Every structure is written in C-alpha cells, then in structure tokens.
C-alpha cells in the first residue's frame, strides 16, 4: 500500500508531530547508520558495488547530461539562471522513468512514491535555490530504497561513498552552472549542504595525522580531498568564496578549533538536529507517504 508522499507540517505547532513521527525516527536512524558505516574509511575504500548502486549512479549521470544539454541563458537577473526551470521540467517529467530503472519490476507500485523524493532532491524551480531540505530529500529517497529492499545492508557504504558522493558532484554543477541561491547567517554551516560534513567527519575519526584544525589549511585540503568528503566540501567553499576563511565561513572556522574529529562528528549531529531537522522553514516542505509516514513512531 504505497502512498504518494505529501506535506504534513503546515504550521509551527506541527513541529511536535514531526519530532514524534515514524518518519523522523527512521530518517535520523538512517543518517546515523550510514554515519557509523563510513567511520574511519577513505573514499577509496574497496566496497561492494551492487546493480542498484550502478543504476543510481547512471541515474545521476543522466541528470548530469541534462545539465550539459541545457546551458545557462543570457538574462538580466544576477541571481538564479532561468535555464534551471528548463532542466527541472525535464527531471519532473522523467523522475518516475528514472526511478523505474533502479527499482525491480515487481516493486513497480513503489516507483511513484519513491520518485517524489527524487523530485524534491534537486532544488526549487520557482526560487532557483537549493538548501539542506533538498539534500534531506535525497537521503529520504535513498532511505526509501533501503526500506523496500532495493538497497541492502551491504550497500550502505556505497550509498555514501559512491551514490551520495556523485550526487554532491551533480548538485555542485547545478549550483555553479545555474547560479543557484542558498535556500536558507553568521552561524550557518554551509551555503548548500550539511550531510557530507557529518559523514565526512566520521571518515576522519582517529585519522593518523589530520585534525580538524587542518581543514582550513589549503595544502592539507589539496593533498587529501580525494579521500575525504569533508575536505571536498571545504575545497568547494574555498573555490566559491574569496578572502579569509574566518570571514566567509565563520561557523566552519570555529569548528576547526574542535580538537577531535570525533567531537566534530558529535557536534555536527546535534547541529543538524537543531538547524535542519528542527527548523520549520525546512521541515514544512518534508513529504510523508507510506515509507516515511507522519504517524507517531511505533515502539
């Protein structure tokens, strides 16, 4: 009994319903499960690559190709590029077809529900913006695939190191190519993302030589970014922004003074709960169906 996911958090008082929901419990449990899975490992870790993972990468490559086929247009506005709406319309019409390439035929009934999260994972057409809510929708998308058994426990490392990693590459391409606005202050973690800082800091726990203080060292980032998701995010920032790190990324600057990656990871998880998952402007757009339901969490 699959259900097309719909919005359920309509006003601020509804946040209580969200925090008590099955969806919330399942979502954060998924994030933390992937977090444990990647602990201490480099991106070059030798993991299983299942058929489903390959199809998910192919899916992202299709989105990538569409960007190439949909160049920015000349326009007066100094914010988001209107060609994004052309790209999004293609994804909007093709999302179910794309998801059907990943989901086995006997689970075709789940495709429309799962596809909704894909449609919510790539930014907002109207505002031409992207935020942690879209990133969360992608995690939700992957969570749904685990729930219906398309992705298995053995795929959890590949989910982060291969699929989510590729997703971030495509999102960065969207953000740069279409000049997308951040959807969301001096204490904001990042313009666009959050999850890669959590899973990335997990990779670096008990690292033999890299400490959090090293991520504001351009040399350290340049020499190590290929192995570490956290450092790849920093590299993106230092390419997108000018001047002293403390000026353009104050929250991350202060995080570099945390003595251990272990505490960075713990703190980022607390920040994620408070600044993403308990933030009404983000959660109001979360969609709930059968796989991630709004009903109170079961015991």
């Amino acid at each position: 009994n699959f259900i097309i996911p719909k919005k359920e958090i309509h006003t601020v008082p509804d946040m209580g319903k969200w925090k008590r929901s099955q969806a919330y419990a399942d979502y954060i449990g998924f994030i933390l499960t992937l977090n444990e899975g990647v602990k201490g490992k480099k991106l070059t870790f030798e993991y299983r690559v299942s058929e489903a993972i390959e199809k998910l990468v192919a899916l992202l490559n299709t989105l990538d190709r569409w960007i190439d086929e949909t160049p920015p247009v000349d326009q007066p506005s100094r914010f988001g590029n209107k060609a994004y709406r052309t790209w999004y319309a293609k994804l909007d019409e093709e999302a179910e077809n794309l998801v059907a390439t990943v989901v086995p035929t006997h689970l075709a009934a789940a495709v429309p529900e799962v596809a909704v999260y894909l449609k919510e994972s790539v930014g907002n057409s109207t505002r031409i913006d992207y935020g942690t809510g879209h990133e969360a929708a992608f995690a939700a998308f992957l969570c749904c695939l685990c729930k219906i058994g398309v992705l298995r426990v053995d795929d959890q490392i590949a989910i982060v190191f291969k699929v989510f990693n590729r997703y971030l590459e495509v999102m960065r391409k969207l953000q740069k190519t279409y000049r997308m606005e951040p959807a969301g202050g001096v204490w904001g973690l990042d313009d666009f993302q959050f999850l890669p800082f959590i899973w990335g800091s997990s990779q670096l726990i008990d690292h033999p030589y890299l400490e959090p203080r090293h991520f504001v060292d351009e040399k350290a980032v340049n020499e190590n970014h290929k192995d570490y998701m956290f450092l790849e995010c920093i590299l993106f920032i230092t390419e997108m922004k000018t001047g002293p790190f403390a000026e353009h990324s104050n929250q991350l600057w202060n995080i570099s003074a945390v003595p251990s990656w272990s505490k960075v990871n713990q703190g980022l998880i607390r920040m994620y709960k408070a600044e993403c998952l308990e933030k009404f402007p983000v959660i109001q757009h979360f969609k709930f169906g059968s796989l991630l339901p709004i009903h109170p969490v079961t015991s």
Partner: peptide
C-alpha cells in the same frame, strides 16, 4: 556557537 561542548 554552542553545539560542540
């Protein structure tokens, strides 16, 4: 500013 205590 206080998530890392």
């Amino acid at each position: 500013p206080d998530y890392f205590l």
